């Protein structure tokens, strides 16, 4: 996160960090969607042109973290993974279409003040809230920044999104970020990849994950926007995996 502010404790209790187990290394953000399931971007786990193809035993997650440079005893939770599931039509060759992956925890986690799942959108919530100008929130760590950072970013008009890149964009992506001369700045960056873009519903006041940080051009550069996996468009596969596996 660039041009954000420190998160308050417990502000993003669905925030998950993905680590390579050996050797230790922060890879990506992710999100808690139940006691047993974590949502992330497929490119965090699989990207063949770079020979990237992590398996479950390569990885750990850390949940309930507020500070980056410390094991947070009594607050943080570390979990191993049973299985990774990548969208079968994830298009790593062209444009990262359907950049989505689920991770099944080895054991269910206990909820606390600091650990609590985010909601996934239904049709009505997606249609109401996914509109240009409407702001969501992304969380992650700062450049080179020991405390979790937060930034609020408005959803961008689709022709403006398309216009900003040579990449073929699909209905499975949206973009967010401030236009130049809006004054305000802010963006997701690199290590925030895989992390959640959340919105608070005005209908029931619950937080919904609408996006997954997917790709962009650099960091908080004028006229460029971060691109996000459209979680609702992919909910059928999410629900299928969670229903089929997860025993």
């Amino acid at each position: 996160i660039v041009e954000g502010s420190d998160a308050e404790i417990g502000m993003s209790p669905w925030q998950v960090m993905l680590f390579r187990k050996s050797p230790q290394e922060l890879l990506c953000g992710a999100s808690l969607i139940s006691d047993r399931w974590v949502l992330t971007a497929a490119h965090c786990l699989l990207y063949p042109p770079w020979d990237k193809n992590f398996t479950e035993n390569d990885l750990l997650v850390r949940i309930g973290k507020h500070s980056r440079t410390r094991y947070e005893r009594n607050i943080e939770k570390i979990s191993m993974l049973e299985k990774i599931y990548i969208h079968p039509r994830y298009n790593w060759r062209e444009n990262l279409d359907r950049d989505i992956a689920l991770m099944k925890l080895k054991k269910p986690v206990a909820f606390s003040d600091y650990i609590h799942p985010v909601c996934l959108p239904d049709r009505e919530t997606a249609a109401s809230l996914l509109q240009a100008g409407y702001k969501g929130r992304v969380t992650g760590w700062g450049p080179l920044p020991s405390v979790l950072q937060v930034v609020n970013l408005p959803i961008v008009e689709r022709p403006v999104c398309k216009d900003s890149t040579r990449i073929r964009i699909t209905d499975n992506m949206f973009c967010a970020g401030y236009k130049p001369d809006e004054g305000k700045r802010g963006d997701a960056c690199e290590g925030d990849s895989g992390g959640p873009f959340v919105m608070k519903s005005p209908f029931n006041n619950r937080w919904y994950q609408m996006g997954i940080v997917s790709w962009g051009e650099g960091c908080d550069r004028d006229g460029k926007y971060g691109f996000y996996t459209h979680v609702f468009r992919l909910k059928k596969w999410i629900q299928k995996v969670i229903d089929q596996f997860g025993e």
């Binding site: 139940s34 600091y114 799942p117 509109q131 409407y134 702001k135 929130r137 006041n205 619950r206 937080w207």
Partner: peptide, 29 residues
């Protein structure tokens, strides 16, 4: 599941975070 998206330190205690109003203000314009 049934209790998703409600933060124990915020919605569950009738407390606002420092910037959530800005999000909701953006929908009601």
């Amino acid at each position: 599941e049934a209790d998703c998206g409600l933060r124990p330190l915020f919605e569950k205690k009738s407390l606002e975070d420092k910037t959530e109003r800005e999000l909701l203000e953006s929908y009601i314009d």
